[PDB]
DNA sequence: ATGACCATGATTACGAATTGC
DNA sequence: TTAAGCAATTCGTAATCATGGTCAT
């Protein structure tokens, strides 16, 4: 069942078991047609900017399961006004009302079964996290993290199933009640941590809730010190948990010394769980940790955030961005780093690039990616709509068709880099460095409908003077630079031949064989898409050096 | 030092707007006999090639072949800032970092000195491998533009049938079809309305309308267009100038 | 075959200029005396009726009655390909599956043949009102002006008192009232305005009025007939026929 | 009761269309002499002041001084006015709306419109200052120059040695246009005026693009520049003027 | 001469993808 | 017969609407 069935069958089995052990029968409620959406959470406004002050982070321990098991929320505790009036139940002792308006009964009347299921799931997650705590290997650390992450999905899948209209026993009352409770709880903890930690009570600064993501509140205490910020965050989380029901508990999880809040549900910073060394560099929602963006953007954003947060030198970051722009414009970026992957869908109303690509591959090759497969492509240059400009990276590598470098500069790399460097250097200074001051039109080995039977008049060098009737790589006007252009060409050829040798010898070492031919189709190797590019470029540069 | 003083800015404005959309970055080669610039679109099926001889200009002080990395959008923005009574002059120093454009009005008035930055497009200078075309037809440019427009309104693939001395356009779309059959016309009153077909070879070729929609934009410079067609060689659309041409090279889709 | 040749290509264009915006699909029923076609909007508030006689043709031959229904947006594309010196000619065979439009000149042999695929299974033609309580006539450009002026202030326009044409519209930003009286001393047989029984007071929908006034291209004089609790008649005169619009009023109490 | 009778219906139309884009809510303070109206821009950088005299109306009663507090609604109503029409403003005592009578020479065509009028105008104290430079040039020339130089940059640099120089330095390049006063042509309307101290200010392009929309009331536009005060852009009327106060950019 | 009509930016809407709780 | 939830951003393409350039008048 774990491979051909979703998360509903697990909660169904748990519910049936707990019911059988409690003398209860689950009705066969005919599933309603569908629904649009009910009211979820209330994500706080993200005060954007660059924050060098340590921002503590306080989040809830399994917010929705804690809310469920804290208020006796279940199917078997769901009363209404008529029921409480007929039974004459006292308020606040026998029955309670949720912020959504629904009625439930306290644990004094009947213990639910969703609380028991959630107790089981959180007691499993506790040991799954303890095992990660007592573990050293980073790969095994990630494995135990994935194991823990799958035990908090099911604990949240309980609430999801109670709120899932498509599926058996859809009780939207309980899902709406837990969402209302969560919203009110984050609002109350924001108010409390802004009230207690201020000037009047005897603190240095005014604590401000910088950002909130429905369970967390990134309070900024103002103290530039980091250890003091961690201690204050711990004290604040403890005081807040003091003001809630037993299963609920706020915990100080992390601190962000350099904090860059890009937008809503999008930020980055340094993970400080210890006041002596940062753990990692987070990237929430940014185009680097996404999958519908070429890996070049990911690498560039990683390096830029490393230079800005870890090393704190914006000048080097801007220089690297300029170098990357120059590489993009001059076709100095490998095809492997310009590959965008998108998950195919069954039906498409608005045509998409990967859908049309898969259709063209089926029409051309003989078989294409079915639904659910991640189709990868690059954006070739053209005039028509973008969905008509997308090609298999192997087809591009074979046919040598040019890549739309301006597209990758403006549509892929411009916006994320701008959004991450603007809070530091301003909007205009950040956008100025994205002007196209240089271009390299390849127009090479593209023999096709028109790119065939065309000449290259071989204009002069360093001046492009068409009056090159006199033979030689230079015209009589700028002949005084005949000792520098040769140096440039020769050093280009040197770099290219060194790289070519390294790549092909490396391919032979990988193939294990030396006396045999290496015909490798592995397109997931970084050196793939690069050996052929370097071979072509070295061929052209050597043919250019042969003019002297 | 290049100093190309024109006679009227509208000439150069139309020259640029004729192909500012298909291509966007060109290399203008100001040599010792005028200006010449060729480029190819990103689809690599359209090749624009412009030649303005020194006769079209009024003054030409360029003594050393210089190159200008023109971005057509910025240059069109600059040219839109010109009047219809100005003698636009393009000036450039020895090593050009920027180009100067002066729309000095004939009557003593406000001179308009704009300094447009230049780039280095680092592209190759191409040239068509010539061949005796199968049919070199001449046709009034306005009629050709109207034909392309109303036909492309239907479908996205226009076909040309040059047979038995009657130029024929056909287009088969989803909503229907459209077939224009113009006979070879000749008259003494209107020299522009002149169509003289060549029976050298019958030509049945189909081009994408997405490129003819850009070809027909340079229809204001030349009152008549010369279309050279060949079943193997790529078709040519020549818009003749006062001392040059704005000829496009298009290849039938296949 | 079906041979219907218009005197000028620019006639069919203006004829369809009224349909294109409001009418989605229409089945043209050809006869031996001319062409007629009707349709109703998807909301069933406005009814269009086309009547084109032979007198607006240089030659007509429709021996057998024909019935073809197509799209106006696609047909308008075909009609826009017509020069001001060409002659339109509808061409359809027996039981047509597609219509053929033909443009020809008179000094240079230029044949422009366009095909157009054509059926909604609906040929409901119903007209009931033949007597209205008031009849008026005014320039087509003047009425459209008042209509588009009043539509800016509200979503409805109320049009009739003794010997006066009143146009009133009340909305959020304010109100607007235009009162036009028939007598004019201009002595021009076109910009004149006539009015001929019982007071009429009915409010219509602006959007429908905007779609109706777009028929001002067919002629230079539109007649408006009003009748309480009856769809008004918005007719545009034509040399051999007319294009009349039947817009139903709104319940006001 | 306030009852104005515009000489031409197109007059008030051009008057409102010259500034209906940079401001949304204005108060028309109508008095015995005429109507005064001023308001700040939505971004609070552009100040406009409207002045109309009794000399531009065929009949102007204005019994009591009343304040007329949406430029969009006024423009939508004024759009109905045709050429052969005499727009008549009508305001009662303490009004909540306003009648705009579009009468015609032919008394068989009458069109009246009512427009619902609360604006808390932060009334500023405008005062005639002694500006460093006082020039005047044709309105079509200035509008053309601004439309030209605004494409190159968002900021425009404007007089040294009795000669103005419009310069705009952007990213795609820079543009320069020289300016010399002259009255050589018999017609003066195409003449350039200029009068004390060198001045070099820089204004945002967008506000200049909104101001040049006032090139529909007069064929000339006067410019008064001061290094320590916002500029003065005024278009002359037969019975008043419509002036603009633009705050320059930072140095 | 006056808007007419075609062409060209702003603005809105929604599909599609992915990630954040 | 079977499928956890919602909130949020970003990008592409179309539809619609304001506004200017040029033409029959
Ligand atoms: C990830 C995820 C989360 N939710 C909801 C449910 C409540 C909130 C809290 O989620 P969170 O990942 O931060 O972790 P959390 O459990 O709250 O806390 P701890 O790691 O125990 O401290 O988000 C969900 O419905 N489906 C999901 O897949
Ligand atoms: S490209 Fe990769 S898989 Fe192929 S030979 Fe080189 S290293 Fe091995
Ligand atoms: Mg949490
Ligand atoms: Mg969270
Ligand atoms: Zn040289």
PDB file of N, CA and C (backbone and C1' of nucleotides) and ligand atoms in Angstrom, chain A residues 213 215-216, chain E residues 21, ligand 4:
ATOM      1  N   UNK A 213       5.238  32.411   9.539  1.00  0.00           N
ATOM      2  CA  UNK A 213       4.856  31.453   8.504  1.00  0.00           C
ATOM      3  C   UNK A 213       3.928  30.392   9.094  1.00  0.00           C
ATOM      4  N   UNK A 215       3.341  29.011  11.820  1.00  0.00           N
ATOM      5  CA  UNK A 215       3.687  28.342  13.067  1.00  0.00           C
ATOM      6  C   UNK A 215       4.869  29.034  13.729  1.00  0.00           C
ATOM      7  N   UNK A 216       5.656  29.749  12.934  1.00  0.00           N
ATOM      8  CA  UNK A 216       6.875  30.379  13.409  1.00  0.00           C
ATOM      9  C   UNK A 216       6.717  31.893  13.459  1.00  0.00           C
TER      10      UNK A 216
ATOM     11  P    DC E  21       9.171  27.071   5.692  1.00  0.00           P
ATOM     12  O5'  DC E  21       7.835  27.362   6.509  1.00  0.00           O
ATOM     13  C5'  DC E  21       7.148  26.300   7.199  1.00  0.00           C
ATOM     14  C4'  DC E  21       5.708  26.684   7.451  1.00  0.00           C
ATOM     15  C3'  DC E  21       4.970  25.785   8.440  1.00  0.00           C
ATOM     16  C1'  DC E  21       3.724  25.993   6.359  1.00  0.00           C
TER      17       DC E  21
HETATM   18 MG1  LIG G   4       6.977  26.475   9.606  1.00  0.00          MG
END
